[PDB]
Design a protein around this ligand. Structure first.
Ligand SMILES: [Cl-]
Ligand SMILES: [Cl-]
Ligand SMILES: [Cl-]
Ligand SMILES: [Cu+2]
Ligand SMILES: [Cu+2]
Ligand SMILES: [Cu+2]
Ligand SMILES: [Cu+2]
Ligand SMILES: [Cu+2]
Ligand SMILES: [Cu+2]
Lengths: 336, 336, 336
């Protein structure tokens, strides 16, 4: 399309919401291509990641880890207004894995504190994709400080299974998984710092061990549990988008499955089916579609169980509805 | 199906056999849906995992690491009587990744020493699936102490390739891969403990490094070698089921291939073909089908070669038959 | 085929070229099945792998890390003359994952210094496959010392997408990724050794941590960046063959995608499409086809960003051509 043709397309301003929730959108595109507008303000802030009060100096898109999920449809244009407040101390930018050219946009969006930029790219490929800050010379540090999220580029006709039958979800959640590398002192205690740059050297040494001290969802151990457990009901169809910008993960819904899983996160690649545990390589997003059939509490984890239960990679789903004895029943309850 | 309909179904009691062998079964289902009955007694026991004599306090289903492979067909019911003898010291349960609800059955099977329980679930999805103990609060420790295995839910019409052609194996083996985390003393020598509880803290510290000290098949370095090597003949079709309940693995048959590999372990997901090395993420089972074409000794390994040859993840196949010089021939033997 | 028919096939000698470049070949097979002859001399040599003068005693097929890409077509035979000069100190051999029997050829090619051997095998399965040295008892050390490469067995009719449409590349590159494990003294300085054998004990200790000190492309940090960046032009179709003989990797083209990716490296397995980041397990090769659409400098990395930017797994592509503002444009450049 020409510059004139793009200029004539309708524009739609979207208001982002904090993960794991996802902003309002329509699965099947309502109309022709549009320029979908988003704005995100970058916030460098301290976040507490465990119950021991361990801190991380987060580099957060929109003030959250992960950054919010942006939803558009194939061949719409995504126009991001990115803002770096004068209150921040570092230059930041953004690389959309969904975009084509200039390092995903990173090369055209480098803004110092007190600056902003507007980047527009055509969402030519359908799927879920990671986005993350990538300042030259400081790439992994930015990413493992939490500056990453994902976007979903839906097919204009919504999702479909491998045979073309439509797959329509009732709810959608976005789980951003983060590997953190927190320095420790000689007594095995996590260190705290008064400035982001103060922890750089120490953090890089831990990063080089390729062994995270924490692996969490939505920025902290137990974040998506209790007041933040995700919800659903028996019979409801749920899409779970999961991203990991720097390290591999293997999601698993304990007590359920991934009925259809686009493990590579790309919708033109047929989804795997009846999955117990799927795999998403570091640097990517994936999506699983599941219809709940049993009520109760479910855990959703990275299935290296040490990472899930020792390091923090576990979330919960509270599901309502009637129990199905045909699917599962306790013939004899635990007894002598 | 109603309670009445299920109660009317025929029942078949199956006797389990120790891995890598698999109990007798039919690839194509004989008759309509059945309630297939299995019984397993849990044994907390000391096992030796290497030639030096390293000991692990194993938590073992049916007394073996991995637990035995249970085989049923899609839409049969798997009814497990699980027994935790009073001689044990910990509470145990079972999570079948093939099951739907109550954390895979984990929430309905918590039995203390001196108790038993009978769980029944409908095997609604075809494929190989991991099962493992998961006591709230000590999940990874239970699993990396060996309390995991797998089941196979065969399609009622047996296996087929991705295009509808029948794939009938002549024999099947179940390779359970286990990552162990054994504490060491200041000399770098593995420690031994009186009771399993004594090793908990030291073991959790090793687990947190995400670096196992041993990665083995059938519970110990070299377990599937020598007089315990697997066997086949030129022309024989073999299905190799492989599971890893906690950590990724990348199986490879040295000297062969994976002709058809359901890398995700799910039979409704078309298998990859002509594989050199496949990948099974932690928390899943996979299966590879191969027709041997050359005689001789083969090694079957996790292809991170350090894990295979330094940590223990290597098995052997002894294969009888005639050498095929068309497929391979030494034109010039090693010479000056 | 009869013995006479095999003997009657044409024999063709091919001159190899050093990675990342690939020797002359045709995508669609020219003529019928042939015995393609290659010769490689093994070189044990000290190489510097980083900007701090760190050394490794490389075990190098044809003198390079990785060894060169050999290209044949399905049902051709690959006949390799392998030479181990008397000036080397170790026994070497070769295991072609593309081959069937005798541990991929390793059991028939064990040559001591001063010996040579000629192995012939029929390339029955299409795809890119790893090859590597595998001396019994020292397999991982040989592989992680750089003695590995890959071959490509093209379908006789060239490559095709999942719908059968032809995929013809304009350029092809081979990126071999190597995990190195270099010993350090108590001060953290990498150690140097007089002879290869001298480093064995110390190196295996580093290998058991499963944590590489360096992860590089083409044998050294920065080998494929700067003036050694790979090249392309907007509109050009490029095939990127990538291998990792011992450890997992997750390739990503920063600013681009993998339009068609045979992630398992096998051409009879349909390629994934529109990939952001693909996954190649240790012990395998994969291939990605992409048509460049934007000019500029691109980075191609292992997307565990710590491995890419701290450990060395980052390459560059320098692409010429006209910028496409439809695909991407800076609506508002970075400004106050
Ligand atoms: Cl940053
Ligand atoms: Cl246990
Ligand atoms: Cl070697
Ligand atoms: Cu940033
Ligand atoms: Cu990236
Ligand atoms: Cu248990
Ligand atoms: Cu599990
Ligand atoms: Cu060698
Ligand atoms: Cu190999």
């Amino acid at each position: 399309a020409t510059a004139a043709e793009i200029a004539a397309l309708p524009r739609q301003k979207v208001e982002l919401v904090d993960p794991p929730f996802v902003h309002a959108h329509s699965q099947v595109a309502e109309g022709g291509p549009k320029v979908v507008e988003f704005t995100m303000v970058i916030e460098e802030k301290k976040i507490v990641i465990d119950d021991a009060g361990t801190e991380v100096h987060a580099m957060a898109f929109n003030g959250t880890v992960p950054g919010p999920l942006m939803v558009v449809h194939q061949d719409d244009y995504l126009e991001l207004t990115l803002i770096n407040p004068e209150t921040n101390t570092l230059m930041h930018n953004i690389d959309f894995h969904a975009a084509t050219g200039a390092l995903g946009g990173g090369g055209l969006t480098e803004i110092n504190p007190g600056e902003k930029t507007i980047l527009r790219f055509k969402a030519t490929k359908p799927g879920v994709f990671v986005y993350h800050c990538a300042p030259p010379g400081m790439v992994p540090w930015a990413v493992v400080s939490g500056m990453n999220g994902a976007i979903m580029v839906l097919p204009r006709e919504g999702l479909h299974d491998g045979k073309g039958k439509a797959l329509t979800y009732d709810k959608i959640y976005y789980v951003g998984e983060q590997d953190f590398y927190v320095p420790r002192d000689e007594n095995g205690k996590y260190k705290k710092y008064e400035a982001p740059g103060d922890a750089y050297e120490d953090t890089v040494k831990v990063m080089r061990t390729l062994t995270p001290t924490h692996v969490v969802f939505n920025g902290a151990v137990g974040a998506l549990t209790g007041d933040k457990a995700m919800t659903a009901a028996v019979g409801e169809k749920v899409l779970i988008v999961h991203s990991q910008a720097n390290r591999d993960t293997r999601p698993h819904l304990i007590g359920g499955h991934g009925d259809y899983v686009w493990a590579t996160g790309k919708f033109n690649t047929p989804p795997d089916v009846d999955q117990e545990t799927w795999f998403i390589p570091g640097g990517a997003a994936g999506a699983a579609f599941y219809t709940f059939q049993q009520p109760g509490i479910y855990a959703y984890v990275n299935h290296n169980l040490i990472e899930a239960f020792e390091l923090g990679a576990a979330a919960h789903f509270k599901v309502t509805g009637e129990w199905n004895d045909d699917l599962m029943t306790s013939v004899l309850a635990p007894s002598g």
